[PDB]
């Protein structure tokens, strides 16, 4: 509350560490469905159904340009990529499986880096 603060958690490396995680997600072999924005002209249904499209390239640009206020807003956009993927893709599809694998991969790096 006013003039009463918990001890300061060191956040000065969060930017570099989120960039490293994002690099690792970018270079994973199952990243291919997620590297670029879904082409809303060419993929029927996507525009209407997925209210907030997100992809690794968009996260990378947001990261590079100071559009994440803190590490949690970064994790929200990563998770949004996977939540969108589950909304639109059957679990038993290559892209559906890619999404589950990438989410697992991300969540472990997140825990090992920050928890």
Swiss-Prot record:
Record localization: Nucleus
Domain Bromo: residue ranges: 9-113
Tissue expression summary: Expressed at varying levels in several tissues, whereas a smaller transcript was expressed specifically in testis.
Domain of life: Eukaryota
Complex and partners: Component of the BRF-1 ISWI chromatin remodeling complex, at least composed of SMARCA1 and BAZ2B, which regulates the spacing of histone octamers on the DNA template to facilitate access to DNA. Within the BRF-1 ISWI chromatin remodeling complex interacts with SMARCA1; the interaction is direct. Component of the BRF-5 ISWI chromatin remodeling complex, at least composed of SMARCA5/SNF2H and BAZ2B, which regulates the spacing of histone octamers on the DNA template to facilitate access to DNA.
Function: Regulatory subunit of the ATP-dependent BRF-1 and BRF-5 ISWI chromatin remodeling complexes, which form ordered nucleosome arrays on chromatin and facilitate access to DNA during DNA-templated processes such as DNA replication, transcription, and repair. Both complexes regulate the spacing of nucleosomes along the chromatin and have the ability to slide mononucleosomes to the center of a DNA template. The BRF-1 ISWI chromatin remodeling complex has a lower ATP hydrolysis rate than the BRF-5 ISWI chromatin remodeling complex.
Family statement: Belongs to the WAL family.
Name of this protein: Bromodomain adjacent to zinc finger domain protein 2B
Organism per entry: Homo sapiens (Human)
């Amino acid at each position: 509350s006013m003039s009463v603060k918990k001890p300061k958690r060191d956040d000065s490396k969060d930017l570099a560490l989120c960039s490293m995680i994002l690099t690792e997600m970018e270079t994973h072999e199952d990243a291919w469905p997620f590297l670029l924005p879904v082409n809303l002209k060419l993929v029927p249904g996507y525009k209407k159904v997925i209210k907030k499209p997100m992809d690794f390239s968009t996260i990378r640009e947001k990261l590079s340009s100071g559009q994440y206020p803190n590490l949690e807003t970064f994790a929200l956009d990563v998770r949004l990529v996977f939540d969108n993927c589950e909304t639109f893709n059957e679990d038993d599809s290559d892209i559906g499986r890619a999404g589950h694998n990438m989410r697992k991969y991300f969540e472990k790096k997140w825990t090992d880096t920050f928890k």
